[PDB]
Amino acid sequence: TEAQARAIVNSALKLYSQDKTGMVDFALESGGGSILSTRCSETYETKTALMSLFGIPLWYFSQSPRVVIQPDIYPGNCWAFKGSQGYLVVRLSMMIHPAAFTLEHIPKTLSPTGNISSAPKDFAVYGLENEYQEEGQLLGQFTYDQDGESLQMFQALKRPDDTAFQIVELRIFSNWGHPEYTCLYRFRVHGEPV
Amino acid sequence: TEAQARAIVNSALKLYSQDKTGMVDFALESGGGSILSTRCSETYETKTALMSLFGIPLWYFSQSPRVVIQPDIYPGNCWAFKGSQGYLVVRLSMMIHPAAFTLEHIPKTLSPTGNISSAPKDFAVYGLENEYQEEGQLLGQFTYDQDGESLQMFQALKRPDDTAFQIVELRIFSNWGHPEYTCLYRFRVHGEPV
């Protein structure tokens, strides 16, 4: 049993060290993914601003959408958009057939307020052939489980015709009750390159 | 047996991934904490970290007290203040009843010098009601143990009257023998929001 236990522990640590999934994240910014900010919903407006220039307050924002494709998920390192509905457009590092998606949010145990009501609740993922096309192809409809684990994976719909995508749209239709904003900590896209 | 071992490993990894403690850190900068720089001890400024651009010497890099509320604790990612006693003032992200504090320092096994003589040794934590107040309420007296674990937690004093605070002062009364400076890697504040 001791050798078996050491093997289980080593396997768990190996998977943990491989971005907790052992799967390529084609949305990861450092790996080649990018946020098409011009096609993203507007960033949440923070009451106060960061700079003042010539008496005019500037920069009423906390985090750029870029953080959504960066692995740090300490509390606050998330993109907040106004309200409970929004969207994010990501260009993948490669042209892939999408297989799964990952959403991460901080656990309730690390939230200062005791809740994750700002976490996304109802969302969908679409594939786009160009970033300016109006209606994308539905890759799946999902719910992020507030009573579930911090990291959640979601399986894409199986399509009869293997069409590839390098642009994906994440639509958040609802959050877990926060009335002012919704914060996205990390979104990952997994699949097979062409 | 095997299932029990996998459960134990998963629980350990989950706790590790939750900032190693599973507890909210109300001092964490990304979550809303900030350093009151004017109320901090003098930074140890050496001229040994030279930043240069195109071979032109540009500036001498020291570390800000801000790093004390940032999670990176690789060797050198610490605030070094002058001498062997000093103080740091942190404004918390929320008004809380403080329950515990955490101090982290690098293990001796990762220290190039073989020792952690620069680690804080004797310290106390006080609560302040306004940023201009000199004398706070003692929240506890503690010693960071150089022969203990890298991360150490300390329970705040139980007071019959649970007064809330959003400003805490950390006073380091002694270090572990380094004659030039004292290095703080990370300080966390845990408690209950009001």
């Binding site: 106060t48 700079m51 003042s52 985090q63 998330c78 914060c183 | 809303g32």
Partner: peptide
């Protein structure tokens, strides 16, 4: 005039 403004309001979390 160049200024950095203080944020007492907590960031989105």
């Amino acid at each position: 005039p160049f200024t950095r403004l203080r944020h007492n309001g907590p960031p989105p979390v």
